[PDB]
Symmetry: D2
Subunit: 296 residues, 4 copies
């Protein structure tokens, strides 16, 4: 039950079925690709009060492996509801990728994961006001939409899948600096797992939540008081002054598990880490249960 | 008029009254401040189909000049509707700053611009499930909200103002590479103008719009066919193959003007620029008219 | 030969045998690895008036794949003279990696490429003033050097090879902006080639030189006036207003050839590029001659 | 004395007269300026085994405040020996700024600080092989050097001053993570002090040194074993598990004093810091003796 002297709690992450898209953004450079990505995946940490859960999947797609031969970056966007996801593909590609210097948007759902199809390009194509043209680029059906820069290229349809949302683990540490050094290291690890993304700022949740509110009636979620170090009768080990949660969404359960696995291993290499836990709902809500003890 | 041999079109930018907040994010470092900022100001280029218009104002606030003595970054968030703006202050601070490692949120509306108040901190404080405390930090009324990291510090209320939204200018260039080298240079200039921000990806709009559609009944906006270089149907000078728009929102008209002014100057120093224009609605819609000829 | 409408001159790059080292830098995060790496590889464009030629090879080495299980980046350092190379290893590891927060230095010269060994770790260990300690980390012989931060971990020996310096190609474009947009795409592509690096700023040479000088007997090298657009008597196509050179060094000839290949391909997808060429010295001096037509 | 609960040792930093140059690098964007700057200032932590001590002074010089109206960043380069300094100016401007896309080099040594001149531009201009033009740019004497990109603009002469090298303080923390969190905050603060730079990686020395060596006659510096947490006989408080040094060089004593001041204050706001100290050589060698208590 230890990884590098760090206790691994015998518990599980409780994750959920969720609708996800996966989008390849290319641009003139990695720099401009990331400009579009950040804007497009921003305001998207959690569907508690964001319109989606979004983030970067692969930060560097080689020019030679993109449809247009340009630098690319894959992102994922998810939602529990499929239509809100479709609305969110339109909004973020339409408002944040279409408007971003030089950037184009292609589907990047693997064929194996494809379940539904959304014609985002087509719906976006009407922006060209009669002047939009369909074409074929590297075997893809795309729309060339006239814009002041020149043209916006967007694939006709995007693959939608049922993914796994809310995979997670907690880093419990001797202090805030130590928990954050460990959490950034975990996230550096999760970066390399294809099919997985971490929607929170830097991948990291500094304010994990519990379903609903004890004192109040109107709140959907509230602080996880059990793991809050400034709260007097909390459920934290001795020597733990800071908790961080890494939350992971993925194309499938195996990607989420891999992300959790390599995330925890990386964290446990950084000093001042006391214990690794995970957040669940007692199996009463999720569709998935990733037991930390099974990953190693 | 010419600036460095670049024709300055004798026209105007038509800007609007808009509700704006201005928020100081501090964090343990400039790095983590920016992690929170990007997430919080992302998906926020335009209210056509984003929930807000958001972006960075001052990217470096010295530790010495913040309430808590930590590295800070000011951002602005705006909307035409004040209540959607209040909802957006809650949503972005609550979901993207509260959850971001180490980051705190303070008001940064100058007293001169303050018109309304919104008690975002207080409304956020209920997340603490009875465990939230009020306090005074550097003469500010804050809420210390217990979170797994330790505490989230957020100011009680945030100043809301009526700002100027939609200031702008177009860079018309001999090519796309040249228009973008000029636009990034403009944006580097606009960065230094306090009270102003550029909500589009990199500050830059590659797909400027017009009100409505000539062809379709279901479009709030569509592409500006008049300034589209591939639309062989258009109002662009000869030698112009690419157009970029820089759109600027500010606390007041004088900030938007200063941003426009130093933006155009910086653009006109970069090669391949043919003409500087601006977008308006014939004075039939806006509340402001910034004549390019008056700035110089 | 044409690539995306871009002419590929039937010429060759002429490259040279050069002594080379390759180093894996790990650290608590990719941020701090990059801090050490940028410092260790800067002032390292050319052996003309720099002390070495140095640059990043692989920018993200996953935590799982490093000896200490931490985020890594590999860099390469080269010199035509082996003695000077060993001194540059010691200087750059000792002054830039040892001194950098959390960074360790491990050997990353492939076994196939190794010809000689340089006991940089052993030579650095004397900094410990008696308190240094030899140890095994992951089957590697390292020195644990006590430092005020804690420890500096450095592998005992680093493998040196005879690699290839001076692979190149020129990008000839309609404008400076177009040239640099193409060149950066090139570099993003080259980034992804393992065992190759581009030592110049951003990978790119804004000021390629020719051997000797037409006016100054005392100068060994001067501006390549043949490719200078502002010289009236240049050998440039009409319509070429900018030339950039990409220079590539690598562990072997194949890595350099691969870098030129993917770099050229990437450049030719960017708008405003007229011609791709390459530099040589008549095929007489160099040990390697890489004909552009043989790449595609 | 205490700052936010952190003890401030009643000791002093002992600093030295050092020759210094200050250079304004402009380029087509802040991005490209930073590319040139990072290359020009790298391999420049300490004159112990680097060829200079170099670093960024001001990271964001607005377009309107530069001679060419482009984005700027200032850097400082220093050496204890003036002749080696002039050589490092020529080497780093010539190999790292001249070669870097879009970058120009202008003098940024304040008039008040100027003692001597170094005609770096004049010396570089011979690269133009007869095609170089002297010219005036906003009242400055520059050389327009033809290069394959277009032109390299470099000011004829650069001002040298006798500045201050070696200002410092130590951060003594409860852990490495806490030490480095405090140290980075420090550096963000120091970033904002004009005329001061921190030459080490990220501004930070993970491996502070002392004059000479106990065991080894060939070493001019070796580990500061008294502040090594893993050295059995150390002079560290119990409860100090990590020490970092911040080393500051500047144009004058005030800039260095100011940097130490704002840097210390910033550090002490970060959690897990026990003590702030500083390094000196008894007050016998150095020309400046900066007492920490005199700062606050
Ligand atoms: N996983 C990690 C994590 C933690 C956090 C952190 O998020 C939060 C979450 C909540 C605060 C509360 C502060 N603001 C408040 O006073 C208003 C609350 C509330 N108003 C609403 O009633 C809408 C509720 C909505 N769902 C509902 O429609 C049904 C559930 C409730 C019902 O009975 O109808 C929802 O899912 O959020 C809101 O939604 O803000 C701050 C930060 C983010 O991600
Ligand atoms: N300051 C610059 C700026 C510019 C921008 C850019 O903003 C915009 C503004 C508008 C857009 C276009 C979005 N397109 C849509 O609304 C389609 C709705 C709808 N599409 C359809 O399916 C049409 C169906 C159909 N009609 C019928 O036949 C029945 C048909 O096939 O013809 C759908 O999604 O369901 C993109 C970006 C932002 O900021
Ligand atoms: O083609 C690939 N190329 C790539 C490439 C091009 C370059 C550019 O390199 C150089 C090469 C040579 C210069 C120096 C030019 N001027 C002199 O040095 C005179 C200084 C001086 N003499 C006088 O007093 C006058 C002295 O004694 O130093 C600068 C930069 C680098 O890499
Ligand atoms: O406090 C501020 N200061 C910070 C600071 C610390 C440092 C770090 O500097 C140094 C200084 C000295 C070393 C040790 C170098 N060792 C050798 O020289 C061995 C010579 C060798 N002989 C044999 O041992 C075999 C041979 O033949 O090459 C490493 C790093 C820089 O700046
Ligand atoms: K676009
Ligand atoms: K699936
Ligand atoms: K990933
Ligand atoms: K996100
Ligand atoms: K302070
Ligand atoms: K926070
Ligand atoms: K106002
Ligand atoms: K601004
Ligand atoms: K934005
Ligand atoms: K180190
Ligand atoms: K080899
Ligand atoms: K590479
Ligand atoms: K380099
Ligand atoms: K500074
Ligand atoms: K240059
Ligand atoms: K001075
Ligand atoms: K440096």
């Amino acid at each position: 039950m230890e990884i590098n002297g760090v206790e691994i709690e015998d518990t599980f992450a409780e994750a959920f079925e969720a609708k996800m898209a996966r989008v390849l953004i290319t641009a003139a450079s990695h720099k401009w690709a990331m400009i579009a990505v950040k804007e497009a995946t921003g305001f998207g940490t959690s569907v508690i009060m964001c319109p989606a859960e979004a983030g970067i999947d692969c930060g560097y797609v080689p020019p030679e492996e993109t449809p247009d031969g340009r630098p690319g970056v894959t992102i994922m966007i998810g939602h529990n509801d499929e239509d809100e996801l479709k609305e969110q593909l339109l909004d973020r590609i339409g408002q944040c990728v279409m408007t971003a210097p030089t950037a184009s948007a292609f589907d990047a759902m693997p064929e194996a994961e494809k379940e539904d199809e959304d014609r985002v390009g087509y719906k976006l194509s009407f922006f060209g006001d009669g002047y939009q043209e369909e074409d074929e680029l590297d075997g893809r059906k795309v729309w060339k939409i006239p814009v002041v820069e020149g043209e916006f290229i967007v694939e006709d349809s995007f693959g939608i899948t049922t993914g796994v949302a809310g995979g997670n683990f907690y880093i419990m540490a001797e202090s805030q600096p130590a928990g954050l050094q460990a959490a950034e290291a975990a996230v550096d690890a999760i970066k390399g797992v294809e099919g997985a993304y971490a929607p929170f700022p830097g991948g990291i949740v500094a304010s994990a939540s519990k379903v609903g509110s004890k004192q109040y009636d109107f709140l959907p979620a509230s602080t996880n008081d059990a793991y809050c170090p400034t709260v007097e009768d909390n459920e934290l080990p001795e020597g733990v002054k800071c908790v961080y949660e890494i939350v992971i969404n993925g194309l499938n359960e195996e990607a989420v598990k891999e992300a959790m696995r390599v995330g925890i291993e990386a964290a446990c290499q950084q000093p001042g880490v006391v214990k690794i836990s995970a957040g669940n709902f007692g199996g009463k809500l999720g569709q998935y249960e990733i037991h930390l003890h099974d990953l190693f």
